[PDB]
């Protein structure tokens, strides 16, 4: 509800059905402690990740495993896994989306942040 | 419902609201006919364009005027517009989704074709 | 050196070599004039479209023919091409790349401008 | 020569100059080890991060610091960093380009990806 992640495939102009999404909040010590994953459905969406309660401020870290997904299809990609670190601001709109839009060699990625 | 336009702000995050969209099919003598138009709505999307029975095989172009937008926005922008020039093929699936990411300087556009 | 156009294929992660790539100027009458040409080269790059003389004030199209890139690689893309309409030289003679990275259903494209 | 970091801003429609650059490198232990850094030029561009010798096959994390450049220019941006992680030689040497194009709440990134 707080957070949404929505993968593309720009490859095959679908979406990215199956991939796996870890999310992590930095802890005091700096390190990288898990938080929520999941598998994106056949919309590419991953929705019930946190709720209200859960997602406070801070850092948070989105890993999406593109290198999975391009061998699962039979191709060779670049990246490990697509990367997307921010931070959680409360004064800022309530609902995020992470979006991220997958080629072998390169991705690009917004956030939507609405009320 | 077969043609459907999303266009996101990539300066605030957010969708982009207001854009004006014109849709054009090419003609016989390869000028282009107006075809559909409309203005995004408060989810940066534009619905109800075109209709199964008139979305028939052939050219299309989408022009989103990005200009107009970030000047409303007051900032100074490259474009004069967006263009999305594609051809819509009955093989392949049967609803056709253009999202845009708009910067100032830049844009990225997909094609989320599903059934 | 006016104008430059760079193009990469993100499937490959590799130059877009052969690219084709054809400039339009807008004209008084609102119609597109053919400006130049060209393709682009093993590093995908394309230079030499025109002079500072030419390149004068005006609305360009740079219509770099995506399809026929991907065609000739023997992929069905979505798009029939990716095209960058601008104003250039309104406030005087700038220096203007064009890039283009590319997907076979989708594309990104991005401007430098510089003063000399 | 073996790894350039390309960076471009696509508010401003101009490299992205002052950027810092941070390399790591994954141990045996699983750990990330710094490998190098650098800030980008007035070009955009980060050369000389390392060398054929010490640049030899693992998983690197390239991490642009994207927060750090969008503040020193006032702006207040969504990601902390933009993180480009790989798998670097593992068929034998090659020549990277990551390059980033970056907006307040987004950025793309690709990799040119060359044998010498
Ligand atoms: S909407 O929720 O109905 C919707 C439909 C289709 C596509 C989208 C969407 N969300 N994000 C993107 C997108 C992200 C990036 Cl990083 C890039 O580059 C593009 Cl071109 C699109 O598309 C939403
Ligand atoms: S080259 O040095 O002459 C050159 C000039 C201008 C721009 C480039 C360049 N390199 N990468 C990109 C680029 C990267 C991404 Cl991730 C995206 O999305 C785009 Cl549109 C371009 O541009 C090289």
């Given at each position: 509800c707080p957070l949404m992640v929505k993968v593309l495939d720009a490859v095959?102009?679908?979406?990215?059905?199956?991939?796996?999404?870890?999310?992590?909040?930095?802890?005091?010590?700096?390190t990288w402690e898990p938080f929520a994953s999941g598998?994106?459905?056949?919309?590419?969406?991953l929705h019930g990740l946190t709720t209200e309660e859960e997602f406070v401020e801070g850092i948070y870290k989105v890993e999406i495993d593109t290198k999975s997904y391009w061998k699962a299809l039979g191709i060779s990609?670049?990246?490990?896994?697509?990367?997307?670190?921010?931070?959680?601001?409360?004064?800022?709109?309530?609902?995020?989306?992470?979006?991220?839009?997958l080629s072998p060699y390169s991705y690009s990625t917004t956030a939507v942040v609405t009320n």
């Open positions: 095959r102009g679908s979406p990215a059905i199956n991939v796996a999404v870890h999310v992590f909040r930095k802890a005091a010590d700096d598998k994106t459905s056949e919309s590419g969406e990609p670049f990246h490990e896994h697509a990367e997307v670190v921010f931070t959680a601001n409360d004064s800022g709109p309530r609902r995020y989306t992470i979006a991220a839009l």
